[PDB]
Amino acid sequence: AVLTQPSSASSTPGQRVIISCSGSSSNIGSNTVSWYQQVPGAAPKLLIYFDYRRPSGVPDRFSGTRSGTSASLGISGLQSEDEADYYCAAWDDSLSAWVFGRGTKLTVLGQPKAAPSVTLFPPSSEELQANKATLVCLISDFYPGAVTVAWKADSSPVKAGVETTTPSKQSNNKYAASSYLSLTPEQWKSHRSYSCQVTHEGSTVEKTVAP
Amino acid sequence: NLCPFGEVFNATRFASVYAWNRKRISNCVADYSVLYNSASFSTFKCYGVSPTKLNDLCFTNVYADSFVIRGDEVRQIAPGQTGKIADYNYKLPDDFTGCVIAWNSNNLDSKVGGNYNYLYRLFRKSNLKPFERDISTEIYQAGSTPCNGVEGFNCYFPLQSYGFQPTNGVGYQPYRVVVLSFELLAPATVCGPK
Amino acid sequence: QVTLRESGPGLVKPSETLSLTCAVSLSSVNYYWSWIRQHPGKGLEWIGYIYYSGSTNYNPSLKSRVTMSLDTSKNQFSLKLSSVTAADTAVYYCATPGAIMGALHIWGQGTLVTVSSASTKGPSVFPLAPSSKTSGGTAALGCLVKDYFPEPVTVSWNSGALTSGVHTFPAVLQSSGLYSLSSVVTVPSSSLGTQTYICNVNHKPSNTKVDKKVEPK
Ligand SMILES: *[C@@H]1O[C@H](CO)[C@@H](O)[C@H](O)[C@H]1NC(C)=O
């Protein structure tokens, strides 16, 4: 709680970045600092312990220093797999507790751009026999992460019943997102068609399904 | 026939506290009057006899222990003190009859970007006996599983780098320490001019 | 080395006691056994540790509500957190720094604990059948895991045999207060008629497991 970390850090592939951690005499000043990496969805992983020591299986690219009340973490030769949240930790004598930094989200910004692959699924006939209707729009394999999704009934836009995720990194280090439109079987059968409009980097990919 | 006090005090390179340097001084004449009358020192504490009295006393051997620590660790160089330096690096007896001298060393031992050449013992199976010097690099076995000389989980290299950078505060800046101890065990061949 | 695995209720009513157990894989070792938690989309918060000597140190923020214990019998150490509110919703990790209280070397997988007055709800699984627009020999078929509470849902395909090209999307939280999820697998359009595709939906907070068959239209 008492350790100060920058919210964000940024670099380009192959380059180096330095994440700093500032504290007090009570923690970093008199105690050892360790660094942890958390890829989203997974548990934290120890990168640096005892200021500069690397545990088993950690490459030379990760490095750490401690000086006075501040600590620094260096990541050489950045790759896209290195996008994660980075935490510094130290023991606080005044608090008699183990203290974490808020975390530093690191983004590799110079990655190859990709256009979204969009799949639109109509409501199951089983779901319609359950008197419900949900349209599933699945957006995958796009970079950068930011994307905007709009829905259309026939050609009139839809804002009611729309729920959309935030982009998520996948195994191939590209981003994916999903959007949902919930309607009634009467509404579904009423219109001639439905459309999921996905805009990414100023360009639009529209998919359409019809009952 | 002066004693090599300058060779200890005005040396270019100082040893690390885990491997502190000791020099035996004998068969010569010293002047604690000159050595103490210099405004260069941050702390000049002599336990037992005083520097003025030391010019009239004689000793068969005088020892000068020199090393480098942080500013906030000079407290540990004292009788009956505890801490990383006192427990694992340099220990003074409770009945210590000697002198502890320290002065700031930032212009001499701090390198921008960190001077990680100065080390200290971070782990040890036992506290140090007074004036004991441990320079072993053996992997500290914190756990039940053997280490076999390789660093790993619960198996840590016992020495740790000091983080010496000139931008940090005074307590985190390096300090040069000289500990004078007087031995009476032989004739007394180290004397004041008086 | 040693392995840690958490096991937790997943849903705890407010003002009641949240209990978890971390199973250690003997437990008469000289380690510190700690607990870490992480509020959704937030940083790591240290809860406390318990020494094998029984010595105990808790976070000053949570000390009054935290109790940790050791059990040589089941080879596990436990965490108990009383007067639980909605701020205690987090993923709870059991970790250990070993014999020296420093960096945490070994972590658990983590368990999600949701604090809400709402009742457990099982999920509705519907198939997302492939259609003529099929995208160039590539076919997308999936499963819709609808209206469950609380998180999480884990989805596998063909009992884990089919792993290549599966993407389980993060869930949305509806105004209902329920979660919905989708899982798509990319397979050859060729194979749509021959091979059987079965998605395995597991909702541990409701003790529910659904194996849905996805058939082409
Ligand atoms: C050490 O250095 C200064 C000169 O820089 C001198 O005044 C002093 O007497 C020297 N000898 C000592 C301290 O024994």
**Chain C CB within 8 Å of residue A180 CB:** yes
- Which residue, A29, A73, A56, is CA-closest to C1? A56
Residue C25 corresponds to which amino acid?
A: S
Locate the chain C residue with the closest alpha carbon to A27: C102
Q: Is B13 exposed, middle or buried (0-12, 13-18, 19+ CB in 10 A)?
A: exposed
**Dist CA B120 CA B132 (whole Å):** 14
To the nearest whole Å, the CA of B180 is away from the closest chain A CA by: 28
Nearest CA to ligand 1 atom 7: B38
**DSSP secondary structure letter of residue B51:** H
Distance (angstroms) between ligand 1 centre and the Cα of B10 equals 6
Residues in C closer than 8 angstroms to B153, CB to CB, are 1, 98, 105-106
Does residue B10 have its Cβ closer than 6 Å to ligand 1? Answer: yes
A119 by Cβ neighbours in 10 Å (0-12 / 13-18 / 19+) ranks as buried
The structure tokens listed for B27 are 């068969």
Instruction: Give all domains of chain A, ordered by start, each with its CATH number.
Output: 8-108 (2.60.40.10), 117-209 (2.60.40.10)
Closest-CA residue, ligand 1 atom 3, reads: B10
Distance between Cα B6 and ligand 1 center (Å): 6
Residue spans per domain, chain B:
1-113+166-194, 114-165
Closest CA to C18 of C86, C93, C127, C113: C113
A53 Cα to chain B: minimum distance (Å): 9
Query: To test ligand 1's pocket by mutation, which of B8, B9, B25, B41 has the most ligand atoms within 8 angstroms of CB?
Result: B9
Helix (H) or strand (E) holding C209: strand C208-214
| C167 vs A: CB within 8 A | yes
* Residue B35 CB less than 6 A away from ligand 1: yes
What is chain B's percent helix, strand, coil content, to nearest 5? 15, 30, 55
Task: Report which residue type is found at A74.
Answer: G
Residues in chain C closer than 8 A to B123 (CB atoms): 100
* Residue indicated by tokens 């540990």: B76
Atom number of ligand 1 nearest to Cα B6: 14
Reduce the secondary structure of chain A to three states and give it as a string: CCEECCCEEEECCCCCEEEEEECCHHHHHCCCEEEEEECCCCCCEEEEECCCECCCCCCCCEEEEEECCEEEEEECCCCHHHCCEEEEEEEECCCCEEEEECCEEEEECCCCCECCEEEEECCCHHHHHCCCEEEEEEEEEEECCCCEEEEEECCEEECCCEEECCCEECCCCCEEEEEEEEECHHHHHHCCCEEEEEEECCEEEEEEECC
Structure's resolution in angstroms: 2.7
Q: For the domain covering C3-115, report its CATH number.
A: 2.60.40.10
> What tokens were used for C150?
């609380």
CATH no. for C124-214: 2.60.40.10
CB hemisphere CA count around B185 (13 angstroms): 6
Question: Taking CA B86 as the corner, what is the angle to CA B85 and CA B87, rounded to the nearest 5 degrees?
Answer: 95
Separation of alpha carbons A105 and A112, rounded Å? 20
The CA distance from A64 to A20, in Å, is 10
Name the residue in chain C with its Cα closest to that of B145: C1
For chain A, list residues whose CB is within 8 angstroms of any CB belonging to chain B: 25, 29-30, 50-53, 55-56, 65-69
Q: Do domains C3-115 and C124-214 have the same CATH topology?
A: yes
**What residues contact A156, with CB distance under 8 A and at least 6 apart?**
none
Q: Which residues of B touch C105 (CB under 8 A)?
A: 153
Q: Cα B93 to chain center, whole Å?
A: 13
| Domain edges within chain C | 3-115, 124-214
Quote the ligand 1 centre to B27 CA distance (angstroms).
Answer: 21
Residues of chain A with C-beta less than 8 angstroms from the C-beta of C93: 43-44
Q: Is C111 within 8 Å of C6 (Cβ atoms)? A: yes
Q: Tokens at residue A107, please?
A: 């983004």
d(CA C18, CA B191): 74
Strand partners, C184: C142, C167
Contacts of B142 in chain C (CB under 8 A): 30, 98-100
Is residue C184 exposed (0-12), middle (13-18) or buried (19+ Cβ within 10 Å)? Answer: buried
Decide if C46 touches A, using CB distance below 8 A. yes
Q: How many CB atoms lie within 10 A of CB A160?
A: 10
Across the interface, do B167 and A55 touch by the CB < 8 Å criterion? no
